[PDB]
Amino acid sequence: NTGIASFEMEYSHWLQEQSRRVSELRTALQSHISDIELKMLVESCLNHYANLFQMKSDAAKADVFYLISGMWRTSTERFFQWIGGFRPSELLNVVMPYLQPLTDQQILEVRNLQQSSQQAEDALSQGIDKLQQSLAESIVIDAVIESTHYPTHMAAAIENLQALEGFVNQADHLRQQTLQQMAKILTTRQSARGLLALGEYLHRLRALSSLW
Amino acid sequence: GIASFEMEYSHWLQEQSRRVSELRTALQSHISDIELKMLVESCLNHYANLFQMKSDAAKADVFYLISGMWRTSTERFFQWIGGFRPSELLNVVMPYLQPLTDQQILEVRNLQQSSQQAEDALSQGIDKLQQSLAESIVIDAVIESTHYPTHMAAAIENLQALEGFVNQADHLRQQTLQQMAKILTTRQSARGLLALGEYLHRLRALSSLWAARPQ
Numbered sequence A: 001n002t003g004i005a006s007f008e009m010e011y012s013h014w015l016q017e018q019s020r021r022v023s024e025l026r027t028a029l030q031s032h033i034s035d036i037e038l039k040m041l042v043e044s045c046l047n048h049y050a051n052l053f054q055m056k057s058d059a060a061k062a063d064v065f066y067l068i069s070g071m072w073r074t075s076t077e078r079f080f081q082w083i084g085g086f087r088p089s090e091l092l093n094v095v096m097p098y099l100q101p102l103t104d105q106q107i108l109e110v111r112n113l114q115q116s117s118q119q120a121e122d123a124l125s126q127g128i129d130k131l132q133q134s135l136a137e138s139i140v141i142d143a144v145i146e147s148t149h150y151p152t153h154m155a156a157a158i159e160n161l162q163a164l165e166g167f168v169n170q171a172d173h174l175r176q177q178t179l180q181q182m183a184k185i186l187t188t189r190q191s192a193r194g195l196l197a198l199g200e201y202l203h204r205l206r207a208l209s210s211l212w
Numbered sequence B: 001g002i003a004s005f006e007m008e009y010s011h012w013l014q015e016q017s018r019r020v021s022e023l024r025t026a027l028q029s030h031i032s033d034i035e036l037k038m039l040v041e042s043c044l045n046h047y048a049n050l051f052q053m054k055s056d057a058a059k060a061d062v063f064y065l066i067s068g069m070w071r072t073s074t075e076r077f078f079q080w081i082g083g084f085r086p087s088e089l090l091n092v093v094m095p096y097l098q099p100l101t102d103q104q105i106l107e108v109r110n111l112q113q114s115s116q117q118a119e120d121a122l123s124q125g126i127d128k129l130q131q132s133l134a135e136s137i138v139i140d141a142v143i144e145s146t147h148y149p150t151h152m153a154a155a156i157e158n159l160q161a162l163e164g165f166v167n168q169a170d171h172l173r174q175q176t177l178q179q180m181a182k183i184l185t186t187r188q189s190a191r192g193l194l195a196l197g198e199y200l201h202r203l204r205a206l207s208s209l210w211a212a213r214p215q
């Protein structure tokens, strides 16, 4: 599959650029980086995640079931995975202590963002659950007849799986919206601390299957 | 140990297909009620063999087991705790049990709801363990130095608790199977097991079908 081959190599380069951004963040939060310089770094990290979503959107058009299944990810990432990636509300919870100290108004805005994300996440999962039910109904009809002498639902099951493409894209849109709203709630230094903890966590997660 | 589990499962599938085929033949024959009851009990005991095989694999490598890499990509798409949600398999096979009495339908629906409740309680347990793992991982990730000790004993050992969840999920599947056998007549149980087995088999072929789609 040419598209997935293209994706795996783009993702390999994405991870290397991501590692550079995380190192820049780690050094910036120890250096005398100016505020405007740190604003541009924060924007570059957000832009780098937007490029991930664009790559994934193109991979979804070549093989959305491969993308959803996360076999391009590690075993540990797959343990946590939700619709091609992570749930944004859970990543927010993971980094939340490393943003502190936040004002009470910011903490409440972060919590309202996490709740709104949790509801959007559940709506998408309930949508996927509806697609799975329709696939299951197609499949059991073919399974109880069990004969190629009688027409099957194979075309309809493929279209069911192809509809996952819209769920991947909307999950990535949610991830993007949560990143961007977090960048509006947080000061620049708080955003940098958040992206630092986020990036280090995602990196460390990957190299955890070796540990087990 | 995982190597052994995969060979047991390989053979377990060969004999599953034989029991499914035997059921399909019986539901076109004039099998006696006692012979059908023996075969229904052969299928229920064959599922018990699966849960015991998985329980032994969970002691060797629970993370492998619960990941479902020993299954197909389609099964993993539908996966809840190393297998299927029994509440959803019940829904898939229900039209094929019909016709049932209104009381049976009610007892089936109550069993599904009680299963859904137990499934969500287990998933909430897993979610708490994942949150505990993540919080341990981010501490090591933010320090990111071999100069400082890590939480990989905490990580490895509370991932060990996944064994308890795998075992109770299988206990819930076996409980659901045996409670359905009590609600249904032998012949209805035969039809349910036939549709269940046929569904599980065909569901595995979904990944091959996707692979061959027009591109």
Ligand SMILES: CCCCCCCCCCCCCCCC(=O)O
Pocket: A049, A084, A085, A086, A087, A088, A089, A091, A092, A095, A175, A176, A178, A179, A182, A183, A186, A191, A192, A194, A195, A198
């Ligand atoms: C300004 C940034 C603050 C930190 C934000 C942390 C929570 C944002 C969650 C969305 C980020 C998604 C990136 C990972 C992609 C995936 O799920 O695979």
Ligand SMILES: CCCCCCCCCCCCCCCC(=O)O
Pocket: B047, B071, B083, B084, B086, B089, B090, B093, B173, B174, B176, B177, B180, B181, B189, B192, B193, B196, B200
């Ligand atoms: C007469 C009962 C029919 C309805 C079935 C209710 C729950 C059945 C539970 C058995 C699940 C076993 C399948 C595991 C998947 C696999 O690895 O093949």
